Design a binder for this molecule. Structure first.
Ligand SMILES: CCC1=C(C)/C(=C/C2=NC(=C\c3[nH]c(/C=C4\NC(=O)[C@H](C)[C@H]4CC)c(C)c3CCC(=O)O)/C(CCC(=O)O)=C2C)NC1=O
Ligand SMILES: CCC1=C(C)/C(=C/C2=NC(=C\c3[nH]c(/C=C4\NC(=O)[C@H](C)[C@H]4CC)c(C)c3CCC(=O)O)/C(CCC(=O)O)=C2C)NC1=O
Ligand SMILES: CCC1=C(C)/C(=C/C2=NC(=C\c3[nH]c(/C=C4\NC(=O)[C@H](C)[C@H]4CC)c(C)c3CCC(=O)O)/C(CCC(=O)O)=C2C)NC1=O
Ligand SMILES: CCC1=C(C)/C(=C/C2=NC(=C\c3[nH]c(/C=C4\NC(=O)[C@H](C)[C@H]4CC)c(C)c3CCC(=O)O)/C(CCC(=O)O)=C2C)NC1=O
Ligand SMILES: CCC1=C(C)/C(=C/C2=NC(=C\c3[nH]c(/C=C4\NC(=O)[C@H](C)[C@H]4CC)c(C)c3CCC(=O)O)/C(CCC(=O)O)=C2C)NC1=O
Ligand SMILES: CCC1=C(C)/C(=C/C2=NC(=C\c3[nH]c(/C=C4\NC(=O)[C@H](C)[C@H]4CC)c(C)c3CCC(=O)O)/C(CCC(=O)O)=C2C)NC1=O
Ligand SMILES: CCC1=C(C)/C(=C/C2=NC(=C\c3[nH]c(/C=C4\NC(=O)[C@H](C)[C@H]4CC)c(C)c3CCC(=O)O)/C(CCC(=O)O)=C2C)NC1=O
Ligand SMILES: CCC1=C(C)/C(=C/C2=NC(=C\c3[nH]c(/C=C4\NC(=O)[C@H](C)[C@H]4CC)c(C)c3CCC(=O)O)/C(CCC(=O)O)=C2C)NC1=O
Ligand SMILES: CCC1=C(C)/C(=C/C2=NC(=C\c3[nH]c(/C=C4\NC(=O)[C@H](C)[C@H]4CC)c(C)c3CCC(=O)O)/C(CCC(=O)O)=C2C)NC1=O
Ligand SMILES: CCC1=C(C)/C(=C/C2=NC(=C\c3[nH]c(/C=C4\NC(=O)[C@H](C)[C@H]4CC)c(C)c3CCC(=O)O)/C(CCC(=O)O)=C2C)NC1=O
Ligand SMILES: CCC1=C(C)/C(=C/C2=NC(=C\c3[nH]c(/C=C4\NC(=O)[C@H](C)[C@H]4CC)c(C)c3CCC(=O)O)/C(CCC(=O)O)=C2C)NC1=O
Lengths: 162, 172, 197, 172, 162, 172, 163, 172, 162
């Protein structure tokens, strides 16, 4: 992937040198911010189910036309698959929080996002809506530093989808 | 190219689950004692010329046939290759130390280096002994407690020792 | 696949497809990775196809696929095969490029390919690189053709990082021996006296 | 990379001979049936996204294990790779249908495909299954009587089926 | 020049994308490191007059044969150049310190240094040991984080000279 | 590459010795017959098209099989390849002649050729016979006594025969 | 892959895929006729193992007396012994470059990667420069004519690389 | 001998009480993991000759002073003895793994071998690197899930690690 | 070790008598044949190097397919090892001649060869044709009873390798 540590190592490797002071200071800043990030990861880990469902019904509520038969929303397997997708994004946001880098998102969701979205006629707007719900919910769930730390990856994913 | 965090995320994706609480706890511990690791990596970085010089001195002392005519480090070009190779090995040792992962070492450097040295007729035992001399000098320079607060680093010492052992074992 | 500067909208995508198929190999490159500013700069000719290929060489996708997961030997072979079209001929090339990288950075290591005279002659500013070692190129070894055959295992195949081989070096064993085994006949009895001691 | 005409030409030049009048008649019949051949190629080309999506849906319905963790087609990158592979295969079968000969397949499509899959670990039986689903989806679009005049094209349907079988056999 | 902010803007600009989490938060870490480095710059600024004489005398005593007549160290003009040049180094040390990166130091000393030393027949060991003396002196002038940041910069400089 | 001077330097160095007086004797000899060697190399350079065309005529005289349809040198794009191979091998033989060792010939020309021709399907016995015919058609231009001083040069003809023989045995 | 006039001319003709035309025959013939003074100087130096190596080490000690005292590089009997060995290496490669009539052996055997090996064992180039100046002095008297010219030219090339 | 269950019963007799529920809990855990244990021991048995062979390769490459004359492996009968020694020590440590209790290792393997080797002149340190190369070779096959369902055996992996650690510290 | 004198001395010791005609007669035979065998071994030493190197070449002329890159026979140290091993074989043959008993072969190489070959996959047939080469040369390089006994010993060596 590409964390802070991993990006520092890549920069000091391609350039074929050692790690100087600035790269070590970047690593130090990462080590500092790790603990708020791990706290946020714990918090979002505990409330996985509530976030996933609340986002699911939020998305169905924003575009009510999706639900009725003859389109994507209808079908029990389809809604279970909606839940699976929203859980996927939530898990990868937690992963980015743990690693303190946008690596896992770029690796697992963003790389290939547009082509898979267009191939299956999926819509980003649904996922921006769900990510907005998770944004709002984590707004009250979290507070302080871990708050903005999680919000940053949430709206990074929203920017990627938008 | 992975650190311990990316390894844990890799296992989590292999299972398909969130990171379990034991994993998160040990990762938080890793991050908390990571300021040990940063200082140890800095010690390696700022001492590396000394380790290289000392490994060269003792290595060519034990095996002077490497500097005898026709020995496989005789001209200045193969001396430069020897020193550059030990320097590179130490670089990826320090990269593994900071990352807490032996993936960068093994993949980026140690995947074909045995076959590289075999294809050129290089005695891999000399390279392995050079790596061991580097680990000994690195430990000598890691005991340095100047300009720093004193504490325990036996975890870091074991990590550096096992990284150097990984190098000297994958070579031959 | 040339790009005459007054070119129109169509076959700009064609040139891009050729470039992303050549530089990166047949490895897929998701348009999450296309440098859009570089393509825009190439559109009006602010950069040539040579400058654009310089950029794509110096992006993080090219590094991710070729540098990080491989040793320096495989990296040198891949640079030759992709930005030049030919396998390296002799260990002198590998030594030169390895020391140049080690001393001056990936930036200078790539500039040694892109602004070399071989690139100026064979492709120039505005011709997309292609594999040319299959034909006899002037002043090669018979190992150049064999190496390009060895690296290019199939049209469908590619040089992919995401593989269980670990993207190992196909050719450094092939390229290694001829320059540095004329001294084997004597290293033999030196090893014998070492063993029998 | 040889069409049917160039194939007859090549096996003529092996005999060091002119093309027999029988081969001239065969290639004249091919050129006469070229209108049917072009309509089949167009039906495949226009319905490329429909065919690829339909085959993907059937493949991921009958086979789920690809998309759960540890499966071949998990992340967005691997789903994109799967769809890209299927699109390429359909594209090459359309090419072969126009050429009239399977030269383009073995030259470009399947030149190093099976080796690539056995390298990356992709289940080759799954790729063959996807090609079979494209066969099933594509015969439906080829047999679309709408917007074209009526005539017997069963030979072309069989030829396209054989192309799909050839790709499936090579991949598996 | 090069700062942490410079690599932020570059590695956000080469990829051709807006600033994502990692580079903004690395800038944040630079911002914590900024002001204490500024007080360290104050400390090394107040003692420049002492340090130039300390470094030149260090050069004189650790190498006796350079000081004897007919050599590089002998000569009033030569010693005035020594003092001026060490003042130049120390001012670049202050510049790099306030910059939170070796940038000004790098592009005023390091980049292609060795042929400059080689042209005039100027040894680098002289400056290695002089900067070692400055290391020892700033070791007692500063303690804790300021001492660490000054020591790392002088170490980077001596590595450049090495 | 290694001519005879650098070759002798190599065997002198790998055994850690200076150049013995006898070695200097042989190599100064080589230097003084250097002008005869230059004459021979010029004879090979200037008569190159004649040697190649004579070898080609003879070679396709015994084996008309090559130039028939389905033969290797048939399609008139492979005839130019045949002639260019002849040019390359003659050029490398003249290079080894001027240098004094087969190092040029065995490094830049011969190490990877038999398997290159196996890969292309080219018969290697025919290439060997082409090189032998080139040796024949090149001695007669090499022995030419016109417009040059007269002297004994049997060493150079022996040596050139050895180089042609070595190239042929490599490819065959 | 040593580089001597024959070797560069063969290399440049191989690169262009052409036979050896008149210009590199010019170089080859001139170089062959120049071989004789070169080999004469090479054998003259070859006889003079001991005088040159010993005089060079003594002149190094004279020019760098501070090296001799303990606590420095020069201290230790085997140390100066293998310093004499280094000087023998340099002399041997000078003779090799004379014989080859090219800087091929000197380059590939000493000058390639010379700065790194000097710095990483902390060797002072001026040591070897002063030794080579002594060798200048010795070949000023031992040789004469074209042989002197070739030997000094090669030794100044070596100095230029070191210095 | 005394297996892990035998040790539990023996300690129960030593305290003269019944089993606790927690005792049955650990014992049931051992019983359920016995399947993974059997997979591990099969991995040992299948590759055992291969493992001892390549481990000996790394050892003798690592230590060349023995196969040469004057070494207690030179006369090539000592080849037989040495290879049998690795075979039997791996066999007993496999016994310990299968039983899950290193007691049988202690008794049948390492009661008194130290005096045995010292009175035989064997330098046990060599044997210590021998057994650690044994673990280095074996752990690869242990991680090999070829033809077996994948799963976590980190408990078993660490158990084998401490087994060979016991062997090392023992013979050392 | 093992040699006619030593079997005699053991079977007189462990049996517990004093020696009589048969064993001392065997000793007579051994002490008289010493000169043929001993000069034969002298000649073997006198011509050994040709034997070993031409034996390597003989193996390759019979086993070229084992030499290509990518299989066991390829390798430089491998080659040095090949010559080394066949050197010991010749050497122990010489010892056998000197001892006038098959002992040394038994004690050193015939003791446990089979399983070390199975461990290292060493085909004995290789060594067999090497020794066949050896006997081809010793037919000419040696004469009379000496070539007779040398051939006998090397034949039994093959029978062991067989
Ligand atoms: C990185 C992990 C990952 C992701 C994120 C991913 C996206 C993804 N979502 C899919 C299905 C789907 N997902 C949805 C979601 C919609 N349903 C309702 O309409 C809502 C408005 C909305 C939910 C917010 C739907 C309708 C499908 C079915 C698409 C189809 O079959 O045509 C599919 C096709 C089959 C499958 O894989 O299950 C993919 C590839 N794939 C992955 O491997
Ligand atoms: C083929 C060309 C070639 C050369 C010439 C060469 C020289 C050379 N210089 C070395 C370092 C050295 N060189 C010297 C020589 C110095 N001692 C002083 O008395 C003198 C002023 C001066 C020489 C006249 C010394 C003492 C060392 C040891 C430095 C150390 O080990 O720290 C070494 C390492 C040998 C060892 O550690 O014992 C070599 C081989 N190397 C090469 O590949
Ligand atoms: C960037 C990551 C990387 C590195 C650094 C690497 C090392 C490496 N060392 C090489 C040769 C060499 N390696 C060495 C060093 C060894 N030989 C002696 O035994 C020494 C005692 C010993 C040093 C410990 C030497 C002397 C050569 C030169 C051999 C020759 O030129 O023929 C080569 C082939 C050509 C060259 O670079 O000179 C590589 C690729 N491989 C990699 O993938
Ligand atoms: C700018 C780059 C950089 C440097 C130079 C650096 C060194 C460094 N190490 C630290 C903590 C420390 N570092 C060490 C380790 C040291 N003491 C032991 O004796 C070891 C021998 C030795 C090095 C391995 C210890 C013991 C501490 C304090 C305990 C702790 O952090 O929990 C601290 C913070 C001091 C504090 O927590 O009050 C710094 C700045 N960190 C960085 O990010
Ligand atoms: C000549 C034209 C051409 C072909 C034919 C081609 C096939 C091809 N597919 C690839 C990746 C892939 N292809 C697939 C497709 C599979 N996914 C499911 O299993 C399906 C059953 C199946 C699709 C039918 C997957 C999953 C990957 C990524 C596998 C990995 O990287 O681990 C790759 C590796 C390139 C890369 O690094 O991304 C190639 C070369 N490439 C080409 O340029
Ligand atoms: C834009 C480029 C272009 C194309 C590709 C093209 C194809 C084409 N289709 C034609 C009609 C036709 N099209 C078809 C094919 C159909 N028969 C059915 O059974 C199938 C559903 C289907 C094929 C699988 C047939 C059989 C004809 C009658 C022409 C004939 O029999 O020769 C004709 C001749 C007009 C006629 O006789 O009515 C052409 C040229 N025309 C164009 O201008
Ligand atoms: C902008 C930053 C800057 C730097 C870094 C700098 C270093 C510097 N010192 C120089 C000359 C010099 N430097 C020295 C000092 C050295 N020689 C001995 O006296 C001492 C042992 C030793 C001092 C530690 C001397 C004597 C010269 C005169 C040239 C000579 O004697 O060879 C020169 C050549 C041009 C000149 O300044 O006159 C430079 C560039 N100058 C700058 O403007
Ligand atoms: C620098 C040293 C070097 C040599 C010598 C060399 C030989 C060489 N000859 C080739 C083709 C060829 N060579 C021949 C010649 C053979 N056919 C007949 O049997 C003749 C008797 C015989 C000529 C003596 C032919 C017919 C081809 C074309 C093969 C093909 O295109 O299928 C090729 C394949 C590239 C191409 O298509 O042009 C090589 C690499 N390559 C090198 O890099
Ligand atoms: C520019 C390139 C160049 C050439 C070509 C050249 C030819 C050349 N050949 C010479 C003598 C000679 N040339 C030859 C060569 C011929 N005699 C034999 O019978 C053969 C017919 C044939 C050689 C196979 C011989 C044998 C000598 C006598 C040299 C001696 O006495 O050793 C000489 C010295 C006197 C003279 O004729 O001017 C020259 C300059 N010199 C050059 O600088
Ligand atoms: C003849 C004696 C015997 C053996 C050898 C045996 C192996 C065995 N292991 C099984 C399951 C398994 N086997 C393993 C162990 C393997 N997977 C892990 O990744 C490791 C790499 C490795 C162990 C080192 C695991 C993890 C399971 C899954 C069962 C579970 O969920 O715990 C199964 C049930 C399903 C199947 O047929 O594969 C068998 C039969 N069973 C026996 O009766
Ligand atoms: C005195 C009694 C004696 C015996 C019996 C003996 C057998 C023997 N063969 C060995 C290697 C070997 N020996 C051979 C066989 C030779 N090489 C092959 O190329 C040829 C076919 C063949 C010669 C004609 C092989 C293939 C190896 C394995 C080399 C390795 O993998 O390291 C080794 C050591 C392992 C090593 O370091 O490579 C021994 C002990 N050594 C002895 O000292």
């Amino acid at each position: 992937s590409r964390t802070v540590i991993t990006e520092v190592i890549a920069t000091a490797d391609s350039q074929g040198r050692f790690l100087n002071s600035t790269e070590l200071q970047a690593a130090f800043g990462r080590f500092e911010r790790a603990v708020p990030a791990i706290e946020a990861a714990r918090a979002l880990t505990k409330n996985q189910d509530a976030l996933v469902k609340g986002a699911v019904q939020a998305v169905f509520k924003k575009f009510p036309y999706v639900t009725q038969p003859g389109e994507k929303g209808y079908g029990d397997s389809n809604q279970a698959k909606c839940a699976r997708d929203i859980g996927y994004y939530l898990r990868f946001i937690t992963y980015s929080l743990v690693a303190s880098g946008t690596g896992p998102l770029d690796d697992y969701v963003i790389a290939g996002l547009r082509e898979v979205n267009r191939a299956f006629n999926l819509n980003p707007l649904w996922y921006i809506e769900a990510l907005n719900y998770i944004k709002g919910e984590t707004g009250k769930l979290l507070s302080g530093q871990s708050k903005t730390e999680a919000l940053l990856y949430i709206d990074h994913a929203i920017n990627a989808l938008s | 190219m992975n650190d311990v965090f990316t390894r844990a995320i890799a296992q989590a994706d292999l299972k398909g689950s969130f990171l379990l609480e034991s994993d998160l706890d040990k990762l938080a511990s890793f991050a908390k004692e990571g300021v040990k690791r940063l200082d140890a990596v800095a010690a390696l970085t700022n001492n590396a010329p000394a380790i290289i010089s000392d490994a060269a001195h003792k290595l060519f002392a034990e095996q002077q046939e490497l500097i005898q005519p026709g020995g496989n480090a005789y001209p200045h070009r193969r001396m430069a290759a020897c020193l550059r190779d030990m320097e590179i090995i130490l670089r990826y040792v320090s990269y593994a130390l900071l990352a807490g992962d032996a993936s960068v070492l093994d993949d980026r450097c140690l995947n074909g280096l045995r076959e590289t040295y075999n294809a050129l007729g290089t005695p891999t035992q000399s390279v392995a002994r050079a790596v061991q001399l580097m680990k000994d000098a690195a430990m000598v320079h890691l005991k340095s407690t100047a300009n720093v607060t004193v504490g325990d680093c036996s975890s870091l010492y074991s990590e550096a020792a096992t990284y150097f052992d990984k190098a000297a074992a994958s070579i031959a | 696949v040339t790009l005459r500067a007054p070119f129109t909208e169509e076959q700009f995508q064609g040139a891009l497809y050729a470039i992303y198929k050549q530089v990166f190999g047949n490895t897929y490159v998701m348009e999450s990775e296309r440098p859009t500013t570089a393509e825009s700069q190439l559109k009006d000719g602010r950069i040539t196809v040579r400058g654009f290929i310089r950029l794509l060489a110096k992006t993080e996708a090219y590094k991710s696929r070729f540098l990080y997961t491989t040793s320096q030997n495989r990296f040198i072979e891949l640079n030759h095969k992709l930005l030049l079209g030919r396998a390296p001929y002799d260990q002198a090339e590998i030594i030169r490029h390895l020391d140049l990288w080690n001393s001056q950075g990936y930036d200078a290591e790539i500039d040694s390919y892109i602004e070399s005279e071989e690139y100026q002659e064979f492709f120039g500013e505005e011709v997309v690189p292609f594999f040319r070692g299959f034909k006899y190129q002037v002043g090669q070894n018979p190992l150049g053709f064999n190496g390009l055959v060895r690296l290019y295992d199939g049209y469908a195949g590619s040089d992919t990082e995401r593989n269980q081989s670990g993207q190992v070096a196909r050719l450094t064993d092939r390229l290694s021996r001829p320059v540095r085994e004329q001294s084997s006949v004597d290293r033999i009895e030196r090893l014998l006296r070492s063993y029998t001691s």
